[PDB]
């Protein structure tokens, strides 16, 4: 009588693929700030993390950081929900920041120890420090180490990078091996990029160097950041940083590698020049290559120098996290949230779209509603494709999650 949550699997059968202008989708439901949240759903075991802060919601006092894992069950009325049974708080909130992946009986969450602060803000202030925290997916009395673990790796095989750290919310498990999204603080001198790769054409206000200079936090920043995947062989703690290839070379932004239709799909936030959502399946994971969806429709808000719908190479460091999933393969229909404003974090909408089209959308809130970090996860519950998204809806500031049912009829 209770439907079981499973990875989105099987042939679609009924599905909608033709544009429909009706409102068919349905979002279904002081002095403290909560930012940098984390949501990772795999096989009915979710994880929620955040960075509770006092007052200022970008530079405030880090009150606490909480990492916990629960199970994705039905509400009892066939509507998906998010239930939690395990929570855990580190001793010092400031050190642990920017933190997950599923392997059986556990849930490994690679984090970063940062006494100085966010390693992006002042990179030299950070020394390379990585800590993995695991929580047993099901609580067990008298467990001991099995219920909760706190391991800091002695070494990481960075390669050319001088320090790498976890940077994305959700990971994948290619078999026994674990994978965690990561960014690399490769030194700005070490990085090489051909100017001709950057497409200066179709834009007259652009300059060739913009692709390289946008890569860093600023034009004088010490380190280029490249998004990637940090692996761990759970059977054997050497971690080797796997990084995205040269195609669509962009800033290392938070990254969600996830398995849809039994295959890895990678998202990267549009922090750099391309404001347009970059998404696609992953051909290979141990060497990294993602076929980016040629999505010529949806973008993200950005500052005056790279605003929404920009396609010109310009030096810009701004953007919001607006990820998406894969509802189907042959139609390549992708469900995600993107904010409706050129240069402000306002008007998020749940969008079920395609490469060069949008099927149907629903306004999550008012046009003036403020929202910047938007995490979306799509899971399958008894032959109907569902999607759960966690968003900071703002007029107490706290990301909240709501689920949406994907319609299989274009009528």
């Amino acid at each position, epitope marked *: 009588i209770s439907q*079981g949550v*499973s*990875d989105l*699997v*099987g*042939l679609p*059968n*009924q*599905i909608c693929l033709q544009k429909t202008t009706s409102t068919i989708l349905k979002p279904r439901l002081e002095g403290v700030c909560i930012t940098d949240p984390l949501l990772a759903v795999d096989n009915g075991f979710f994880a929620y993390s955040h960075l509770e802060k006092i007052g200022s919601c970008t530079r405030g006092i880090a009150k606490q950081r909480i990492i916990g894992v629960g199970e994705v069950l039905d509400r009892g009325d066939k509507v998906p929900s998010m239930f939690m049974t395990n929570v855990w708080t580190p001793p010092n909130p400031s050190t642990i920041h920017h933190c997950s992946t599923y392997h*059986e009986d556990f849930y490994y969450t690679l984090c970063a120890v940062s006494h100085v602060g966010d390693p992006i803000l002042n990179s030299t202030s950070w020394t390379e420090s990585l800590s993995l925290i695991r929580l047993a997916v099901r609580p067990k009395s008298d467990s001991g180490d099995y219920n909760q673990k706190y391991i800091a790796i002695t070494k990481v095989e960075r390669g050319k990078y001088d320090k790498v750290m976890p940077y994305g919310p959700s990971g994948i*498990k*290619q*078999g*026994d091996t674990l994978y965690f999204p990561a960014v690399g603080f490769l030194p700005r001198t070490e990085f090489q990029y051909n100017d001709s790769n950057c497409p200066i054409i179709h834009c007259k206000y652009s300059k060739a160097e913009n692709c390289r200079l946008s890569m860093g936090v600023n034009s004088k920043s010490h380190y280029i950041l490249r998004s990637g995947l940090l692996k761990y062989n759970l059977s054997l703690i050497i971690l080797q940083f796997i990084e995205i290839a040269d195609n669509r070379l962009t800033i290392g932004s938070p990254s969600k590698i996830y*398995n849809s*239709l*039994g*295959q890895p799909v990678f998202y990267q936030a549009s922090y750099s020049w391309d404001t347009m959502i970059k998404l696609g399946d992953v051909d290979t994971v141990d060497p990294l290559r993602v076929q980016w969806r040629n999505n010529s429709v949806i973008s993200r808000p950005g500052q005056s120098q790279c605003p929404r719908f920009n396609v010109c190479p310009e030096v810009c460091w701004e953007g919001t996290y607006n990820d998406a999933f894969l509802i189907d*393969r042959l139609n390549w229909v992708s469900a995600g949230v993107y904010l409706n404003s050129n240069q402000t974090a306002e008007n998020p909408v749940f969008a079920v779209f395609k490469d060069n089209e949008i099927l149907y959308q629903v306004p999550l809130a008012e046009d003036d509603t403020n929202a910047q970090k938007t995490i979306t996860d799509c899971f*399958l519950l*008894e*032959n109907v494709i569902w999607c759960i998204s966690l968003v900071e809806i703002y007029d107490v500031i706290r990301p909240k999650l709501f689920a949406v049912k994907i319609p299989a009829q274009c009528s």
Partner: antibody, heavy 119, light 108 residues
Framework: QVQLVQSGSELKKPGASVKVSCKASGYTFTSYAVNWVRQAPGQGLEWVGWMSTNTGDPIYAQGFTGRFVFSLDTSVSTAYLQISSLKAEDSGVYYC????????????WGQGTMVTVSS | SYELTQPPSVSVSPGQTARITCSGDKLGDKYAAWYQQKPGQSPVLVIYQNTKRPSGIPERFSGSSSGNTATLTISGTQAMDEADYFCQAWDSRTNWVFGGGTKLTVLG
């Protein structure tokens, strides 16, 4: 009570064709897609192809030529499998089973129609 | 081209737990299902989702998957488990792949 019932035994000469019906009773044909499996005599199960009840789009099938053809009439709520130019190898019990839980399992199976390619 | 290699013969005395293992490339993430078909009968699903049991079935069946193997265990073999056991998993890239089936010989 949900079941997929087919026709009786058919004896077909080589090079001929046979229509194997797949009725649906006790459950809505629209919701769950239908899947085709044949069991060779003395061997294991083999998945022939997957058909869509609602869309009726090109029904997916396992790797081979276009000898097998899928179609349906939603008014009568049955699925058909045309086997043109039957070969002696293309013999055995053919069941139709629904994809009850998508890529999880086949919930309800067919009683099978023993198609015999007898010279 | 996906395969579910499953051993042909498994022998077990009454009361002993019988283990049947399906070997497939990365079977941890692929959801699996288990079918038994006694001779001259349509196959019946017994174990799917690697842990769950369909409605109205005996509880003596239990499954587990780890690495490249998924295993169904029976808590003692009775006179009805004498059948050929089939396991399968769904693959996006190719198809609804099926296993080779195992022979469960039970003494008496």
């Amino acid at each position: 009570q949900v079941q997929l019932v087919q026709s009786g035994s058919e004896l077909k000469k080589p090079g001929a064709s046979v229509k194997v019906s797949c009725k649906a009773s006790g459950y809505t044909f629209t919701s769950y897609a239908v899947n085709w499996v044949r069991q060779a005599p003395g061997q294991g199960l083999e998945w022939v192809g997957w058909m869509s009840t609602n869309t009726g789009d090109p029904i997916y099938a396992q790797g081979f030529t276009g000898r097998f053809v899928f179609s349906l009439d939603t008014s009568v709520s049955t699925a058909y499998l045309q086997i043109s130019s039957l070969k002696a190898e293309d013999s055995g019990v053919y069941y139709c089973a629904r994809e009850g839980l998508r890529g999880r399992a086949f919930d309800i199976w067919g009683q099978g129609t023993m198609v015999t390619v007898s010279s | 081209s996906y395969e579910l290699t499953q051993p042909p013969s498994v022998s077990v005395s009454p009361g002993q737990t019988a283990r049947i293992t399906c070997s497939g490339d990365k079977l941890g993430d692929k959801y699996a299902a288990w079918y038994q078909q006694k001779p001259g009968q349509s196959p019946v699903l017994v174990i799917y989702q690697n842990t769950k049991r369909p409605s109205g079935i005996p509880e003596r069946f239990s499954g587990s998957s780890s690495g490249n193997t998924a295993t169904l265990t029976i808590s003692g073999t009775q006179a009805m488990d004498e059948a050929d056991y089939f396991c399968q998993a769904w693959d996006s890239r190719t198809n609804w792949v099926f296993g080779g089936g195992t022979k469960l010989t039970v003494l008496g």
